Amino acid sequence: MLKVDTQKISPQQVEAFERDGVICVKNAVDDIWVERMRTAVDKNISIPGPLEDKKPQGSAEHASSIWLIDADFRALAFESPLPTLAAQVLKSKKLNFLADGFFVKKPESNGRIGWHNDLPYWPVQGWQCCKIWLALDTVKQENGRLEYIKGSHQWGKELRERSNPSWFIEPEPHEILSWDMEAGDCLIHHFLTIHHSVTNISSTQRRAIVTNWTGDDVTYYQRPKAWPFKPLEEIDLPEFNSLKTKKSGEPIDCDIFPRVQV
Ligand code: NI
């Protein structure tokens, strides 16, 4: 550490992430990255993802693991500022890229994604897990923004969407955090922070790229109904060979969950 070092995430923002479970980073990537990823999203939104067989309409267009086939998604994960931001908020010395994806709400056909946190969808366990949600369009409320229950990552509770457990009380409006965003801004949220996203009622699409990241204290855990949402034997891609031979408790590191420079 040098006396001249500056970090994109201020120490106060690092502390806000721990307190609230979510922060917003303005200008997370520059406009060159924005244009490159707009093209990559527009290219991949029309086809099933690498893990699907080449379609029912959801509340958003979504696929995962685009970096396996697309060099621009791969470059965003490994060459852009995003892995540096993830390392800064997790405060970890190791960093794994867990998965990428897109979520696009098209005005013709989208809807609300209900209250949930992300942990129950991923075969991991441990505190240092976060999602970076990179906006590629203007995102205010009318555009289908995300909103968060402040501090809910500290509750120690998993919430699958529409699971309706008795402990979960609908939040009061003043308990809900959100931001206005422009293309290139990102949200970074903890895997236990409960969030939802409202309907895009605007005339323009709401494109976002997601990257998921894990740090020092995380291990593999084959919880039910988690990504990749199908038996591993049904996936032929070589990156998954190293995951098939992995057992719970072991570090995440493998070809599908690769280590990234810190
Ligand atoms: Ni989510």
Explain how this protein is built.
The chain is an alpha+beta fold and 262 residues long. The protein has one domain (11-47, 58-244): Sandwich (Jelly Rolls). 18% of the residues lie in helices and 21% in strands. It contains 5 helices and 12 strands. Strands 1-9-6-11-3-2 form a 6-stranded antiparallel sheet. The protein has a 4-stranded antiparallel sheet with strand order 4-10-7-8, with no helix packed on it. The longest helix is centred in the first third of the chain and has 14 residues, at 31-44. It starts with 10 loop residues before the first helix and ends in an 18-residue tail after the last helix. Residues 116, 118, 195 line the site of nickel (II) ion.
List the helices and strands and how they pair.
Layout (H helix, E strand, L loop, with lengths): L10 H10 L1 E4 L5 H14 L16 E4 L6 H9 L2 H9 L5 E10 L7 E4 L7 E2 L3 E7 L10 E4 L26 E2 L8 E5 L4 E3 L8 E9 L4 E2 L20 H4 L18
Antiparallel strand pairs: 1-9, 2-3, 3-11, 4-10, 5-12, 6-9, 6-11, 7-8, 7-10
The structure holds nickel (II) ion.
Nickel (II) ion binds next to loops.
What is shown here, in short?
The chain is α+β, with helices and mostly antiparallel strands.
